[PDB]
Amino acid sequence: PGNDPQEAVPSAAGKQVDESGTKVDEYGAKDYRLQMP
């Protein structure tokens, strides 16, 4: 006890990692990455 600094930001475990819940601005720029090539 008596040791609580900072850091502690990564969080990814399990088979269902489903890392798609917070993107804010990402779906709008997905279409722009297709018509350019």
Partner 1 sequence: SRGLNRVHLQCRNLQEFLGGLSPGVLDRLYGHPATCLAVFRELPSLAKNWVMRMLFLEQPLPQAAVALWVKKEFSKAQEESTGLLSGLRIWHTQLLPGGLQGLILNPIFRQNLRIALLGGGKAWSDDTSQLGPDKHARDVPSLDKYAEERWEVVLHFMVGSPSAAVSQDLAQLLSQAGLMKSTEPGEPPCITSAGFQFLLLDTPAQLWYFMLQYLQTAQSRGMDLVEILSFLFQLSFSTLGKDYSVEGMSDSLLNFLQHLREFGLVFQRKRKSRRYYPTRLAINLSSGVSGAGGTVHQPGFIVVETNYRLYAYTESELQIALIALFSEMLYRFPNMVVAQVTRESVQQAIASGITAQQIIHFLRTRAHPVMLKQTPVLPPTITDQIRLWELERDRLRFTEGVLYNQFLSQVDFELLLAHARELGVLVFENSAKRLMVVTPAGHSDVKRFWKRQ
Indicate the residue type of 9: V
E strands, 1-37, are none
Query: Is residue 8 a contact residue for partner 1 (CB under 8 A)?
Result: no
The pair of three-digit structure tokens given for residue 5, joined into one six-digit string: 């600094």
- Residue 6 binding partner 1, by CB under 8 A: no
Interaction between residue 37 and partner 1 (CB under 8 A): yes
CA count, 13 A, side-chain hemisphere, 17: 5
Q: Which of 19, 24, 28, 32 binds partner 1 (CB under 8 A)?
A: 19
Using CB under 8 A as the criterion, which residues of the chain lie in contact with partner 1 when the complex forms?
Answer: 15, 17-20, 23, 26, 30, 33-34, 37
